[PDB]
């Protein structure tokens, strides 16, 4: 009568750099919602940060969320 619901609160709106609305869609379809970010650009961001395309937005830990917000500031520091 006690099973951990530590993951079951995921379908809520996440906040990010510019957009205050970013819900669960996927990991690469959630990156398109930020303005200036493209559909071919969003796949390059995910292959560097060792995040899987299978996961959603909201299935990421408080460490793994911010790793995509540093690398969206400087695309030159991580090679491109």
């Amino acid at each position: 009568s006690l099973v951990s619901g530590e993951k079951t609160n995921f379908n809520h709106i996440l906040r990010l750099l510019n957009t205050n609305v970013d819900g669960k869609q996927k990991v690469v379809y959630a990156l398109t919602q930020i303005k200036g970010v493209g559909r071919r650009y969003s796949n390059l961001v995910c292959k560097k940060a060792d995040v899987d395309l299978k996961k959603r937005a909201g299935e990421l830990t408080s460490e793994e969320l911010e790793r995509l917000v540093t690398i969206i500031q400087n695309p030159l520091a991580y090679k491109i």
Binding site: S1, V3, S4
Partner: protein, 198 residues
């Protein structure tokens, strides 16, 4: 449904279990009577038990309905614990209701409980039938699977997993239904499949 190809049943979170048919956009029958969450249910297998449904709820009640008369339950059994799992036996006579730290075998031929079997510490999650309809494997939050005989209901064997397990099934090969491998899904997020090949 084990016999018909288009009939299915649904136990929802509110109070309802209900029968759907696949072509229709409406539930064919509605059954109310539970007072809490209903979260486990099954059809009744058997030649005589064509349309009977069992579901147990979190209101510590197992109810079995005739699908011909959509009034109340045909039979009701009140337990002491929030009822987690339900399976009927393949003869169609007896039924295992897994509630809390104990499972319970009940008759449906004469509406009387047979026996309360407590051998788990934490709450039992999932029951499964085994080898030839002869052995029931139960899995609990204790990290334990335990396989019981069906004639005397003694703890025949068991095993322990590194996490509190949530789902358990032994699954069968094919013709004559020899059990291929047992899979346990645990709270840690792992499906452990243990394979036996003969």
């Amino acid at each position: 449904s084990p016999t018909e190809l288009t009939t299915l049943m649904s136990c929802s979170d509110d109070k309802t279990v209900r029968l759907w048919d696949l072509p229709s956009n409406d539930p064919t029958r509605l059954f109310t009577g539970h007072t809490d969450y209903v979260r486990c249910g099954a059809f009744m297998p058997g030649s005589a038990n064509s349309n009977l449904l069992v579901s147990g709820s979190y209101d510590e009640t197992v109810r079995v309905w005739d699908a011909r008369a959509p009034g109340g339950a045909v039979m009701t059994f009140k337990h002491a614990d929030p009822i987690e799992d339900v399976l009927p036996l393949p003869s169609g006579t007896t039924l295992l209701a897994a509630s809390g730290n104990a499972i319970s075998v009940l008759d449906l031929v004469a509406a009387k409980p047979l026996r309360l079997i407590t051998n788990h510490q934490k709450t039992v999650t999932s029951l499964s039938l085994a080898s030839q309809g002869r052995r029931v494997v139960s899995g609990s939050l204790d990290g334990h699977v335990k396989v019981f005989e069906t004639t005397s209901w003694n703890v025949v064997a068991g095993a322990k997993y590194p996490s509190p397990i949530l789902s358990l099934s032994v699954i069968t090969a094919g013709a004559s239904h020899d059990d291929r491998h047992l899979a346990v899904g645990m709270q840690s997020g792992v499906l452990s499949i243990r394979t036996r090949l003969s």
